[PDB]
Design a protein around this nucleic acid. Structure first.
Ligand code: BEF
Ligand SMILES: [Mg+2]
Lengths: 381, 402
RNA sequence: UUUUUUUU
């Protein structure tokens, strides 16, 4: 297999080359010998109508190990960008599986654009450890359902990272069934490696050093891959940090329209990020697409307030985190009043909803710090 | 006999030496051309591969720019030793019928062992894990800046920090205090000082103040020279990191370098509010090179960021580099107007994953210290911190008091 | 590109 041999180290590999008779050249020499053989990747349809099976390790960037894909092969299995393909092969000879299933079942399916959207019906419940405090307060402040289109807004240094890592940890802890993949846009090289090591799932990232077009290309590869899995009635969950920097990437790419909104945002810049984030939806036909992206506020940048206020009219769930709490050093740093979930009565039971409604009423008059302090002590006992 | 050592020597010693065997640049050349006819010549410089395939060894005194003393390097040597831009080369040369015949050393190492090495892009990035204490312990007045720096924002190997402050707040003075602490405390690290589009009195001072390599480009120089100089410095840094060397670049400033790119880069398809789109990516490649290598070595970059200048272009450069650095040291103008140095904003200063740079107790006592200072104003906080540290000679003895 | 928008 091409992918497994790329993962294989040169030390173990070179021994095989001796028994058979650069790593990218030593591998191509071992691959050609056996021909006298399989590979996989994620499809990307070019402008000629052709395709390339990008590799997740290369972050779906144009690589040499990509497998050429014929247009006729797209015509037969109705393949589109984002589909996962595994078959014998560089040129793609034959396909064995499309989206982890038989290719004959992929030909007949409802397109993602035709799936009937709905409000999150099913609930994503979030050991007694100290890390469970952030997750237990989350269920109370803003419930999350399948297809939820929510944000994690907070000032810098507050702990946007710690909250996403805690959510991802609880997703694979309570919902191993749901497909979890973490997207990082304009992320720091030290923070991406840390992410890959403590999270259970796929991690697609794009360092801050990458160009804006790269941030856009990566994000659209992941979001399209999710749409394909939802067409197969699977529950997908995407964790992005952050939607704010991704919107700035689209604001850098979008052609200048001559009109500039407040904060310095182009008038046509927020359409594409609105479709990426708006792709998250609940489907009755089967499966769902959940997106939890962090939003930056109180950063001193007027541009980030316009972005947040715009995506707020696009999403339906928000979990605010206070900086004054991060200064007090207490966690979780959550602004209970500002937090909230739309159509929350569907995800929670009647008893649960009444107990949550009566709770918010008591916390509303309280201050930000005193509210979290009372909640942390009530959950500890 | 040496080309660089012959142009470095004064004219008086050069002419008298030439009489035994006109402009200085032709005196040295005439001495070399006659010394070649005697049957006996060596040169050195930093490699720069041109678009044509061949490269020329740029000299440091020329700030890595084209010079009549530059040595031609055939495409052959580039293939034999897999040479890339930034490689320092030292071998015997010859006058043109200048050209290099044989290299004796590549990147201060033997050509053979240097041919095969892991690329810089393949190196894996990590959080800084080796602390770089700045306080010299001399008890000098300058140590106050380094002591407050260690308590506010710790620095490590592969650190990527920013000295953010308004004009005339003490950022250039900060790098002077850092370079002195890098040479005094960590002489093992390779120290390079890059001064982009700044005052000409500040480059001459920087050269006499700290021992190392000061590569600069005053505001007398075009914006095209600012970029090229920075390109040569960063590539040289990457080559040294490939030899597992701990490199530390002190840039001043990142804003001025980002402005030079915007002026040089061909008009982007779109112009953001005015700075170009593709123009801001190039500085991110220079500043993003800073990282901690798991395989070995590191690349530290501490550049100064300019704010509150009344320029939208400066505020855009800062917004794009704000969340980039894992280390930030803010300076206040109000503290500087009161002439209270170091004029540091202790509350906004801090570093990411600093629990890897400080001991458990240290990190705890630093957190207690930040809690006490948090309510205070920025001027009251610094005068309070300087006072507590004045009672002590070293930060450690200051810790035990708490 | 300028002005308008960004922008007060
Ligand atoms: F004027 Be300072 F050097 F920013
Ligand atoms: Mg200065």
């Amino acid at each position: 297999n091409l992918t497994e041999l790329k993962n294989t180290p040169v030390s173990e590999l070179i021994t095989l080359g001796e028994n058979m008779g650069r790593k990218q050249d030593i591998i191509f020499a071992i691959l050609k010998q056996h021909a006298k053989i399989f590979g996989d990747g994620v499809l990307e349809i070019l402008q000629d109508g052709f395709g390339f099976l990008r590799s997740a390790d290369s972050s779906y960037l144009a690589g040499p190990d990509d497998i050429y894909v014929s247009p006729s092969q797209i015509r037969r299995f109705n393949l589109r960008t984002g589909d996962t393909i595994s078959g014998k092969i560089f040129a793609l000879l034959k396909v064995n599986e499309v989206n982890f299933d038989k290719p004959e079942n992929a030909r007949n399916k409802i397109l993602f654009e035709n799936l009937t959207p709905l409000h999150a019906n099913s609930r994503l419940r979030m050991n007694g450890s100290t890390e469970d405090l952030t997750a237990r307060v989350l269920d109370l402040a803003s419930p999350i359902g399948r297809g939820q289109r929510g944000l994690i807004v907070a000032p810098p240094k507050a702990g946007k990272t710690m909250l996403l890592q805690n959510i991802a940890q609880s997703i694979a802890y309570n919902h191993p069934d749901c497909v979890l993949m973490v997207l990082l846009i304009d992320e720091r090289p030290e923070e991406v490696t840390e992410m890959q090591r403590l999270v259970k799932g796929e991690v697609v990232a794009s360092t801050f050093d990458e160009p804006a077009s790269r941030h856009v290309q990566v994000a659209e590869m992941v979001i399209e891959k999710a749409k394909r899995l939802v067409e197969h009635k699977k529950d997908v969950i995407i964790l992005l940090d952050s939607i704010t920097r991704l919107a700035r990437a689209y604001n850098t790419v979008v052609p200048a329209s001559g009109k500039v909104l407040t904060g310095g945002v182009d008038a046509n810049a927020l359409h594409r990020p609105k479709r990426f984030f708006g792709a998250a939806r609940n489907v009755e036909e089967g499966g769902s697409l959940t997106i939890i992206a962090t939003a930056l506020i109180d950063t001193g940048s007027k541009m980030d307030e316009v972005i947040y206020e715009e995506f707020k009219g696009t999403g339906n769930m928000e979990l605010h985190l206070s900086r004054k709490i991060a200064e007090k050093r207490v966690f979780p740093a959550i602004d209970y009043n500002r937090s909230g979930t739309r159509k929350e009565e569907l995800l929670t039971t009647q008893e649960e909803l009444q107990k949550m409604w009566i709770l918010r009423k008591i916390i509303h008059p309280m201050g930000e710090i005193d509210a979290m302090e009372f909640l942390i002590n009530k959950l500890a006992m």
